């Protein structure tokens, strides 16, 4: 189903967002 | 219908958010 | 119905988040 | 049901995220 | 099924994102 596929894409993009925020948090502490 | 369309819009906005976070991460590294 | 209304709220809050992140990116640049 | 409840939780967490980003934007400005 | 499980994963990743943003906000206040 189309909805299940779009939700898997949303979940993957959110994992990327969470990882980039961990990089930003570390860069701000040096 | 509307649910499938709104989830595609959510997925598109999340890609924009992921990209702007990668730009912010790069700006903090010069 | 209820599901579609909650998803429209989620979509609207995500547009707000995307815009605030664009503002942050501009301030840092 | 479970799906309606999880979507309400997602909407609520996104309002928190939107607020924290607005606080970050103000700190940087 | 699959959709309920994907939505629980999305909710969990969003709680992590909310936490990391609070850590970033505190670092930016020193």
Author numbering:
A (entry chain E), B (entry chain B), E (entry chain A): 1 to 30
C (entry chain C), D (entry chain D): 1 to 29
Paper text:
Expanding this pattern to hpphhph can produce larger α-helical barrels. Here, we show that pentameric to nonameric barrels are accessed by varying the residue at one of the h sites. In peptides with four L/I–K–E–I–A–x–Z repeats, decreasing the size of Z from threonine to serine to alanine to glycine gives progressively larger oligomers. X-ray crystal structures of the resulting α-helical barrels rationalize this: side chains at Z point directly into the helical interfaces, and smaller residues allow closer helix contacts and larger assemblies.
Our hypothesis was that these should direct larger and smaller oligomers, respectively. Encouragingly, the new Thr@g sequences consistently scored best as pentamers: for the a = d = Ile variant the pentameric assembly was favoured outright; while the a = Leu, d = Ile variant scored equally well as pentamer or hexamer. We determined X-ray protein crystal structures for all Gly@g and Thr@g variants. As predicted, the Thr@g peptides formed parallel pentamers. Summarizing these data, Type-2 CC peptides with sequence repeats LppIApZ and Z = Thr, Ser, or Ala, form pentameric, hexameric, and heptameric αHBs, respectively. The average distance increases from 8.0 ± 0.1 Å in the Gly@g nonamer to 10.4 ± 0.1 Å in the Thr@g pentamer.
